[PDB]
Design a protein around this ligand. Sequence first.
Ligand SMILES: Cc1cc2nc3c(=O)[nH]c(=O)nc-3n(C[C@H](O)[C@H](O)[C@H](O)COP(=O)(O)OP(=O)(O)OC[C@H]3O[C@@H](n4cnc5c(N)ncnc54)[C@H](O)[C@@H]3O)c2cc1C
Ligand SMILES: Cc1cc2nc3c(=O)[nH]c(=O)nc-3n(C[C@H](O)[C@H](O)[C@H](O)COP(=O)(O)OP(=O)(O)OC[C@H]3O[C@@H](n4cnc5c(N)ncnc54)[C@H](O)[C@@H]3O)c2cc1C
Lengths: 473, 473
Amino acid sequence: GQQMGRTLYDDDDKDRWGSKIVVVGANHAGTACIKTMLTNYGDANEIVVFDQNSNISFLGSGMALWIGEQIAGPEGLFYSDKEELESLGAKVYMESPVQSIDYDAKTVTALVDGKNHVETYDKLIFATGSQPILPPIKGAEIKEGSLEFEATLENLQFVKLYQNSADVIAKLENKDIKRVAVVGAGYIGVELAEAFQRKGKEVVLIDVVDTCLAGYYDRDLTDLMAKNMEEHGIQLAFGETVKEVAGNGKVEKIITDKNEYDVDMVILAVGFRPNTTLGNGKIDLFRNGAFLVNKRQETSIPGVYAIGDCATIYDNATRDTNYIALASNAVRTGIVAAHNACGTDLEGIGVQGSNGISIYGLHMVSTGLTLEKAKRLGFDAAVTEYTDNQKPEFIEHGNFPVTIKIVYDKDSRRILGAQMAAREDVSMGIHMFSLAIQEGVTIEKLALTDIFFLPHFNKPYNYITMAALGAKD
Amino acid sequence: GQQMGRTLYDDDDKDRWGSKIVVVGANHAGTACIKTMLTNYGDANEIVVFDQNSNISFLGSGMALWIGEQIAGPEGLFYSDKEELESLGAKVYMESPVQSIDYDAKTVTALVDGKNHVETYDKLIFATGSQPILPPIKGAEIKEGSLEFEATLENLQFVKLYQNSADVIAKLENKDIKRVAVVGAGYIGVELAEAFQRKGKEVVLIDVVDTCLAGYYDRDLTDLMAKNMEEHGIQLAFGETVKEVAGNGKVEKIITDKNEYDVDMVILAVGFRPNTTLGNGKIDLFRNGAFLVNKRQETSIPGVYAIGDCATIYDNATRDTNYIALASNAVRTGIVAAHNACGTDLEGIGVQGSNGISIYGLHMVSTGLTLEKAKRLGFDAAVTEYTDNQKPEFIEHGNFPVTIKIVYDKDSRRILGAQMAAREDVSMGIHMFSLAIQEGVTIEKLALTDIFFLPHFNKPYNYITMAALGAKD
Ligand SMILES: Cc1cc2nc3c(=O)[nH]c(=O)nc-3n(C[C@H](O)[C@H](O)[C@H](O)COP(=O)(O)OP(=O)(O)OC[C@H]3O[C@@H](n4cnc5c(N)ncnc54)[C@H](O)[C@@H]3O)c2cc1C
Ligand SMILES: Cc1cc2nc3c(=O)[nH]c(=O)nc-3n(C[C@H](O)[C@H](O)[C@H](O)COP(=O)(O)OP(=O)(O)OC[C@H]3O[C@@H](n4cnc5c(N)ncnc54)[C@H](O)[C@@H]3O)c2cc1C
């Protein structure tokens, strides 16, 4: 598991009011925030929690691992629970949806055991996350009133909760499910494509765009990832807009503008949107509905905070407010918010959208902006790349080539992003680029950065130094 | 190999000066400097090189690899040579030791083919490196006039040149060599101890200090490494000062202030000191004798630079001038001196003493100051550490524990160093810390740094984040 004690920000409460803090949502962001408040300021504040689901902390990435038989079962895909939060001092109401907030009276109303439950608060923290987007596809609809995204058509699956994952695992126990279509080639769909193929199904990955992982890796790497999937039995249907999902009583065929595929199941991995309705317009929202928050995760309403996927985050690569739905950001915004609502002044430092993906032996990582996105967003970006073996050629075993791409602002010279891909795990190296971007390090300064040398680990003239020195523009 | 075109610093000679540039020494630092000058400013300058040895670019780290038989031979241990430098445009005199310098007439006097050769210069760049340290030990003497560190006593070996390595190898063909004594428990001595053990020799590792690797790791990790060596039969004799190496015509035993050992071969790996004799007292020196240089690698004599093992370097961990004999520094200082010497203003950024070591499957990396070293320097330091598995417990294979230590200043909160140990390669990780120290990142800021999450690579609450968040002091 993963549980600690007091963080290093924990400030001595001099003369601050003892606040009653209500948290809406106790998943990845909520749990992080709650535990931080309890393990750091304990009894000084009354923590009350509401979550409409029946479970919390389910690791989304566990869905593909489970389906792809990379792990025996669901055990371990949860790292905390109600009992764990109560043992730290929180009062937890599960399966209790908060349905309205009164910012003037400072109360929230939730549905506890079918009955309006009113709870007062001094500080309010929204950790309501997001929910999957239903695309305009004929035949794709959710059963009215469903709270677990259940499609009306049998075998049309959504991605979001543990229930959704178990649903698929169970259905897959049906020998009639031989062909699966995965809609959306972002990292979620890519992993699910591999997962289904690994389970032994026929998979067709469909996306309106011409390649996979378009928002995080440049064409060289996405092409590589696509080739990787193809060489494993996954059929690629890029550049196709899904029109309809048909069948008689269950999924039987998916129709795009360029083809028709016979399939026994369709998975929608098209993205999510923030759950901010409780705001009731009283709170400033980002263009996508996310609660707009400053670096202390505070909303436009004092004493009201938003964290995780229901709120924005500061992107150091673009140097603007942004929206990055990642468990990593959920944990940090939760930690930042916890300290502030408890009276400790703590400014967040922004994020770079660092991410990693591992598909059939191909390991990739990236952080910041790809060259294409940097340009599309108006930066005079350039990229410097290099492909070389990780270790000196004289090393007899465990060597392998690594490709690195360092994107930088030709103008200001600051690093805007980096990408790495290799057949072995070099993911630890992306951390340096995350920090580099956060700190505003230039491609020039980076080139001279002290990168150690040991033949067992790298080359004297390693690919990082070489890529940086090779910068042109 | 490891060659390239122009660096990103290559500045267009608006209206600069071309110079006659003489380089003394063409090994790691020299070759890096020479190639940078010739590759970026080609014909604008005239480059003459002098090196007293008969070969250059030999990677010292391969010595242990060679003896311990982890690699085929020494072939890939060279990455450049006389012909490559000359074909780049430099005049190269191999086996030509510069015996004196006239700073007034701006001439160097070398011994070329038994006769003196006077070369005039506009700019002088010292890359004379270092030579092995030889404390006063009875029976330990280098042959008079030997420029190859050949001991007068048969089987008393030094660790410096390719020839030294080739020598030991040849001597190991002598069935009589059964037990080896390694003097010096730094990384070189530890690596050689493993190498001789692998060759099936009986090894006794001797050091004045109570532990191995005292300069780069804290007692925890060094104790771990000690046990690692003992686990393979290496006898440790720490806390002992070698007083004499005895033998009737050849090494028969070595004696310390606490004991005596019967050995057949003795290797001295006590350390290195700068070769700055040519300074002739006209150039300011550092406490240890190294040419004292600034951020541009220039000595106290305008037009005269010094790089690599013969000069100092700026340490961002201590935030002061320091001496750190590493190839990584040789390379970077050489690149900076090249640009500056050729008219391109380029200020160096300093180094952190980043380093790595791999012995019997135990991989460790460190950068900056250890807690003990920080304190030995007067820093009010503290360390925050953590040990946990690399990935979630639910991961089937490839998981392993990692121990991380982060040393910081209790007052400024500035990060001073970091160490990592695991039985799987997490070396890429030390780079982020090396950059952190360079950029003066605080432990609080580091705790909030964007570290991605992907079950295949790490845990949501990874050990770096956890360690940082746990800064108690
Ligand atoms: C298949 C998949 C794979 C992923 N893989 C990775 C990965 O490998 N690495 C990574 O960093 N990220 C990954 N993510 C993203 C990560 O899971 C999300 O960023 C994270 O779950 C967001 O956490 P959150 O707490 O902000 O929101 P959510 O997970 O959306 O949780 C919000 C919580 O609040 C509750 N709630 C909402 N409204 C109310 C209400 N009105 N009243 C009471 N309770 C309410 C909900 O029940 C829920 O428990 C993945 C996501 C998916 C779907
Ligand atoms: C066994 C061993 C293992 C090592 N492992 C690592 C490691 O894994 N990682 C790492 O980063 N570093 C390592 N190092 C350190 C690294 O080798 C040195 O930091 C580096 O060699 C210094 O390069 P240099 O060019 O400054 O000096 P040197 O290598 O000392 O070379 C100086 C050159 O100048 C010439 N010269 C000297 N005086 C004169 C003169 N008067 N006239 C003409 N020519 C002259 C010499 O012949 C020589 O070629 C190791 C060293 C050893 C011995």
